[PDB]
Amino acid sequence: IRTKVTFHRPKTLKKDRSPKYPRVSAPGRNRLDQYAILKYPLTTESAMKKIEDNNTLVFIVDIKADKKKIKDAVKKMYDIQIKKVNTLIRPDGTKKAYVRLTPDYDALDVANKIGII
Amino acid sequence: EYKRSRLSRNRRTVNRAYGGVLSGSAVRERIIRAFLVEEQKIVKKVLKIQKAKEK
Amino acid sequence: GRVIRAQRKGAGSVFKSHTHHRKGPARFRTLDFGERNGYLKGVITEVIHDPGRGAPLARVTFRHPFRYKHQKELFVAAEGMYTGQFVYCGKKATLMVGNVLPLRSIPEGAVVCNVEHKVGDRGVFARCSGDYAIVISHNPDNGTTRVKLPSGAKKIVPSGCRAMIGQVAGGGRTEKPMLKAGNAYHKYRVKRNCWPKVRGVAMNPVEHPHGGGNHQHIGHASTVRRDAPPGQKVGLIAARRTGRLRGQARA
Amino acid sequence: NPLFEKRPKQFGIGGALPPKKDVTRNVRWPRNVTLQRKKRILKMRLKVPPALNQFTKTLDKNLATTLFKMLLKYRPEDKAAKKERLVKRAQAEAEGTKKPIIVKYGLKHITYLIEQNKAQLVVIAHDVDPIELVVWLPALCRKMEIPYCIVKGKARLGSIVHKKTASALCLTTVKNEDKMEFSRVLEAIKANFNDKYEENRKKWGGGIMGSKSQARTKAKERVLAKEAAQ
RNA sequence: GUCGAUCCUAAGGGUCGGGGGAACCCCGACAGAUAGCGCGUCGCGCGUACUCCGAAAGGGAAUCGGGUUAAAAUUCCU
RNA sequence: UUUAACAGCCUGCCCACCCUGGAAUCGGCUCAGCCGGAGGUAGGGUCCAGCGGCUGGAAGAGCACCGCACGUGGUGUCCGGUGCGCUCCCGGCGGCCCUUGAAAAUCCGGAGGACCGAAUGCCGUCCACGCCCGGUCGUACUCAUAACCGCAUCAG
RNA sequence: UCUAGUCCGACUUUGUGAAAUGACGUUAUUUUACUUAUUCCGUGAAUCGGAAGCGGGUUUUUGGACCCAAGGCUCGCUUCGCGGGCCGA
Ligand SMILES: [K+]
Ligand SMILES: [K+]
Ligand SMILES: [K+]
Ligand SMILES: [K+]
Ligand SMILES: [K+]
Ligand SMILES: [K+]
Ligand SMILES: [K+]
Ligand SMILES: [K+]
Ligand SMILES: [K+]
Ligand SMILES: [K+]
Ligand SMILES: [Mg+2]
Ligand SMILES: [Mg+2]
Ligand SMILES: [Mg+2]
Ligand SMILES: [Mg+2]
Ligand SMILES: [Mg+2]
Ligand SMILES: [Mg+2]
Ligand SMILES: [Mg+2]
Ligand SMILES: [Mg+2]
Ligand SMILES: [Mg+2]
Ligand SMILES: [Mg+2]
Ligand SMILES: [Mg+2]
Ligand SMILES: [Mg+2]
Ligand SMILES: [Mg+2]
Ligand SMILES: [Mg+2]
Ligand SMILES: [Mg+2]
Ligand SMILES: [Mg+2]
Ligand SMILES: [Mg+2]
Ligand SMILES: [Mg+2]
Ligand SMILES: [Mg+2]
Ligand SMILES: [Mg+2]
Ligand SMILES: [Mg+2]
Ligand SMILES: [Mg+2]
Ligand SMILES: [Mg+2]
Ligand SMILES: [Mg+2]
Ligand SMILES: [Mg+2]
Numbered sequence: 017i018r019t020k021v022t023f024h025r026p027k028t029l030k031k032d033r034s035p036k037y038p039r040v041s042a043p044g045r046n047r048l049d050q051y052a053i054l055k056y057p058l059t060t061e062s063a064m065k066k067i068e069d070n071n072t073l074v075f076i077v078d079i080k081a082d083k084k085k086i087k088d089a090v091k092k093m094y095d096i097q098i099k100k101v102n103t104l105i106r107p108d109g110t111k112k113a114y115v116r117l118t119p120d121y122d123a124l125d126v127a128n129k130i131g132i133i
Numbered sequence: 134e135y136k137r138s139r140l141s142r143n144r145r146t147v148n149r150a151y152g153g154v155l156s157g158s159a160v161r162e163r164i165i166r167a168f169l170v171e172e173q174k175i176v177k178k179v180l181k182i183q184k185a186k187e188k
Numbered sequence: 189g190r191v192i193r194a195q196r197k198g199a200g201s202v203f204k205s206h207t208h209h210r211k212g213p214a215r216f217r218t219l220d221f222g223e224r225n226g227y228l229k230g231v232i233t234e235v236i237h238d239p240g241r242g243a244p245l246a247r248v249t250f251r252h253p254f255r256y257k258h259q260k261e262l263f264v265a266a267e268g269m270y271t272g273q274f275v276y277c278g279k280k281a282t283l284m285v286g287n288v289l290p291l292r293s294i295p296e297g298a299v300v301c302n303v304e305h306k307v308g309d310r311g312v313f314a315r316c317s318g319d320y321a322i323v324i325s326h327n328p329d330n331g332t333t334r335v336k337l338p339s340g341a342k343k344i345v346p347s348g349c350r351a352m353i354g355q356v357a358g359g360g361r362t363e364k365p366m367l368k369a370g371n372a373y374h375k376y377r378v379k380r381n382c383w384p385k386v387r388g389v390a391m392n393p394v395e396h397p398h399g400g401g402n403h404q405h406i407g408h409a410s411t412v413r414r415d416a417p418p419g420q421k422v423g424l425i426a427a428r429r430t431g432r433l434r435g436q437a438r439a
Numbered sequence: 440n441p442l443f444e445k446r447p448k449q450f451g452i453g454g455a456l457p458p459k460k461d462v463t464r465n466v467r468w469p470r471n472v473t474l475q476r477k478k479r480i481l482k483m484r485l486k487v488p489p490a491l492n493q494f495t496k497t498l499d500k501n502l503a504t505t506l507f508k509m510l511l512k513y514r515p516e517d518k519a520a521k522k523e524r525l526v527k528r529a530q531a532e533a534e535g536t537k538k539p540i541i542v543k544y545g546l547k548h549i550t551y552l553i554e555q556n557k558a559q560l561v562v563i564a565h566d567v568d569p570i571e572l573v574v575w576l577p578a579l580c581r582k583m584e585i586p587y588c589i590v591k592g593k594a595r596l597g598s599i600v601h602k603k604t605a606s607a608l609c610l611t612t613v614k615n616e617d618k619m620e621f622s623r624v625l626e627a628i629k630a631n632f633n634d635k636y637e638e639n640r641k642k643w644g645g646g647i648m649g650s651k652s653q654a655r656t657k658a659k660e661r662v663l664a665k666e667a668a669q
Numbered sequence: 670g671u672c673g674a675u676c677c678u679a680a681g682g683g684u685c686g687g688g689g690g691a692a693c694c695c696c697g698a699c700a701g702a703u704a705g706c707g708c709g710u711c712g713c714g715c716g717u718a719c720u721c722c723g724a725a726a727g728g729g730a731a732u733c734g735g736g737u738u739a740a741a742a743u744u745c746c747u
Numbered sequence: 748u749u750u751a752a753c754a755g756c757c758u759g760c761c762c763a764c765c766c767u768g769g770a771a772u773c774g775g776c777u778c779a780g781c782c783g784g785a786g787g788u789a790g791g792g793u794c795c796a797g798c799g800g801c802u803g804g805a806a807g808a809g810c811a812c813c814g815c816a817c818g819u820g821g822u823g824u825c826c827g828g829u830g831c832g833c834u835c836c837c838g839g840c841g842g843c844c845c846u847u848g849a850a851a852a853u854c855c856g857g858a859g860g861a862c863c864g865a866a867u868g869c870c871g872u873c874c875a876c877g878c879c880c881g882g883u884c885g886u887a888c889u890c891a892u893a894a895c896c897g898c899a900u901c902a903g
Numbered sequence: 904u905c906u907a908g909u910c911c912g913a914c915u916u917u918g919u920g921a922a923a924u925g926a927c928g929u930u931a932u933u934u935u936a937c938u939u940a941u942u943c944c945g946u947g948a949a950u951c952g953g954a955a956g957c958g959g960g961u962u963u964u965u966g967g968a969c970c971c972a973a974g975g976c977u978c979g980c981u982u983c984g985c986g987g988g989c990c991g992a
Pocket of ligand 14: 393394397
């Protein structure tokens with residue numbers, strides 16, 4: 017018997033796809049690796065003052081990189097921990113990242129290892 | 134600003150039936166109405182039993 | 189020529205009804221078993237104003253016949269209705285102002301409003317403020333009823349059609365003079381884009397049959413036939429007569 | 440236990456909410472369901488010409504079971520059975536026979552057998568769609584003096600021949616061991632379809648109104664009948 | 670994270686199905702097996718045909734002083 | 748001649764509400780209204796607003812002034828009055844309409860009580876404290892008698 | 904000199920009957936009956952039709968509340984606890 021005057025489509029089984037061949041032969045290579053994310057540090061006078069005043073490293077990064085990926089790229093690249101990352105898109109269309117290291121790390125020491133100072 | 138995480142429970146409740154929804158006077162009116170109307174139904178029910186047996 | 193004003197209204201656009209602040213359609217409950225056989229009690233919660241509608245509206249709450257929930261309704265308010273009043277709808281509802289009954293249960297000579305034309309259409313006749321219908325007679329053989337409409341016309345409707353007892357509230361509205369263009373502006377601001385009206389004789393020939401001439405004058409009979417095509421049918425359409433209605437004509 | 444009590448509910452208009460009820464007859468069915476139900480009604484409302492009305496007079500249930508039981512004894516071989524004999528012959532051919540007795544199916548093949556007068560019994564399905572495929576078969580069988588019957592279910596006929604459906608079946612010859620009971624079945628079938636063919640050519644079917652219409656019509660004629668005696 | 674966009678809906682816009690149309694296109698939830706949701710752990714219950722677009726002045730989770738640049742900040746520093 | 752968000756405590760406007768009590772010789776009351784046996788006046792309470800008060804924040808800051816050196820120290824930042832004043836916000840009342848002046852997201856509360864623990868150790872917990880996390884895009888500058896449009900560094 | 908629209912008739916959609924009248928078993932006209940074509944109205948398609956029981960000759964002083972069944976009978980039962988069946992309706 018039916019207690020509802022409105023007919024509702026009954027639930028039917030649905031299977032998950034089990035393709036006989038993969039549409040793509042293999043996964044694509046990672047196009048946003050650590051080297052792709054971190055293009056080069058910024059060596060302007062304004063950028064340099066932030067190395068010691070704020071313990072901050074200024075990087076030019078790929079425009080498609082987010083703060084989460086920048087944080088992981090800096091960890092893999094220079095083996096340093098980050099307190100916070102601030103990003104902006106410059107008028108020339110490139111992305112700049114202000115990376116502040118934790119007190120456990122010294123930006124000036126890391127800057128010398130990079131080779132900008 | 135009424136969100137539970139932002140306001141203590143005592144500030145968004147009144148300890149009474151329909152507290153925070155009906156005033157005290159309104160609750161009093163409903164309670165009396167519910168009791169009196171229910172009593173009148175009993176009178177109607179009994180009153181028709183005395184007349185039903187009339188035969 | 190160009191498309192005259194009367195023709196441009198049908199396309200909609202700037203001539204659509206202004207309904208932004210309207211409270212919704214005012215109508216009876218949907219006909220169901222309870223109203224067909226017995227009666228259902230409702231309570232009036234508030235009497236509200238509907239922009240563009242002279243007659244006030246009444247919000248009524250009903251207990252749903254078979255669902256655990258309230259059933260909200262919006263009725264055209266009858267004269268005498270008040271908040272907290274109990275309203276009874278159904279075949280066996282008593283003959284009192286505000287109740288909704290089928291015409292079959294309403295005796296001859298009664299005053300009714302919001303009368304259905306088709307059983308269950310929820311009311312189409314006598315809905316404006318101060319208007320009502322009068323039950324004339326019943327025809328048990330045909331199962332039909334005769335009622336007198338506000339215009340003075342007699343109509344046959346099936347006896348199952350529902351109607352509210354009494355007349356529509358808000359009567360006497362049109363007796364008060366407006367006195368001002370601004371009052372007319374506010375009246376039609378909430379109805380539709382129909383005011384002010386420019387006289388055809390004040391226009392040019394391109395946009396109205398009455399336009400043009402070195403004097404303002406129609407130049408041909410303003411009475412036009414029924415079959416005139418759109419754009420030509422202006423003035424007194426299919427007029428059986430004209431001039432002041434004297435004697436039996438104004439009956 | 441005195442703590443248990445009866446709590447009756449007073450139903451009716453404006454009373455206690457009624458419990459869950461069967462509203463099946465009021466269900467707003469999908470389009471497909473509605474169309475097939477209206478299709479059934481429309482067929483019986485309209486007058487059915489005799490050539491189509493003869494398919495409603497199907498073989499009786501009691502005789503149908505006997506006829507279908509015999510057909511099961513002459514089923515065509517299955518796909519697995521068919522392959523199993525073709526390997527028994529290949530080996531036989533390598534190592535250096537009787538005509539089968541089975542039911543004939545297929546409208547094209549059956550019509551040929553009827554025209555050649557080699558058919559002894561034709562079984563026709565009553566629910567062939569389009570009906571024009573078999574609406575003429577009874578006339579052909581009558582003209583060829585071959586007994587025929589109309590049975591219910593093209594799916595049932597198809598199951599005999601290992602097919603989803605079959606429009607009609609034919610028996611060119613039965614095995615000699617059971618030619619007596621088969622002969623009796625022919626007499627009953629021939630007396631119900633072939634012998635009644637001429638009288639059924641003027642029997643228009645359909646014209647059946649709905650139950651509400653019939654009740655409303657029967658009430659009107661009672662008034663006329665009740666006024667006849669007075 | 671705290672200023673906005675982003676979210677919400679307004680007049681309205683764009684559409685499924687259906688109905689039109691040689692077609693470009695027209696109508697726009699109106700001819701229809703909606704979307705799914707809830708609770709247990711896949712089952713029960715519910716279920717009225719749009720999970721769409723439409724506001725940097727409508728609605729709306731949360732940042733404040735003090736300091737800092739040649740040029741930025743309720744965003745940087747404390 | 749200064750005092751932020753935020754936190755706690757206090758205060759309790761104009762209204763609303765509660766208890767006692769029972770009013771004509773009617774009284775209470777606003778600039779205007781208006782309110783009272785459907786319970787006034789009066790007496791005592793509850794609640795609501797705050798861009799109100801105090802403390803924390805916070806003087807360690809800011810500002811002013813006087814020094815010492817050419818970063819560093821000291822002193823002060825105090826006590827009242829006034830209003831048909833101006834700007835903004837709020838409260839309450841009244842006038843006006845044949846005009847009665849959006850919606851939804853979201854959030855809070857309520858009615859109901861299926862179901863559920865313990866014989867006292869489990870269950871429940873919108874309480875306090877502690878721990879972790881925080882995407883994307885916009886952000887410069889002009890906003891105009893020179894950064895917008897008018898062919899321009901145009902009296903528009 | 905034409906045209907959208909509009910009015911009007913025929914055929915088509917378009918079937919089932921009856922009566923009156925008329926013409927040559929067919930057949931026109933008129934009125935009327937039927938419901939499934941077609942058209943329209945209503946709803947979240949929620950008590951329609953018929954026949955029984957019951958009553959005689961289910962809800963109206965009130966601005967409340969109202970759902971997921973109490974109860975009875977009856978099988979299985981891994982039993983005084985679960986799962987089904989029929990009433991309640
Ligand atoms: K034109
Ligand atoms: K206008
Ligand atoms: K005018
Ligand atoms: K003229
Ligand atoms: K906005
Ligand atoms: K608003
Ligand atoms: K700060
Ligand atoms: K704040
Ligand atoms: K900025
Ligand atoms: K200028
Ligand atoms: Mg940013
Ligand atoms: Mg005028
Ligand atoms: Mg002029
Ligand atoms: Mg002209
Ligand atoms: Mg914000
Ligand atoms: Mg809209
Ligand atoms: Mg489009
Ligand atoms: Mg389509
Ligand atoms: Mg719909
Ligand atoms: Mg549906
Ligand atoms: Mg959305
Ligand atoms: Mg949007
Ligand atoms: Mg805004
Ligand atoms: Mg600046
Ligand atoms: Mg007092
Ligand atoms: Mg302090
Ligand atoms: Mg100081
Ligand atoms: Mg201002
Ligand atoms: Mg509770
Ligand atoms: Mg700026
Ligand atoms: Mg400037
Ligand atoms: Mg400016
Ligand atoms: Mg230009
Ligand atoms: Mg009829
Ligand atoms: Mg419909």
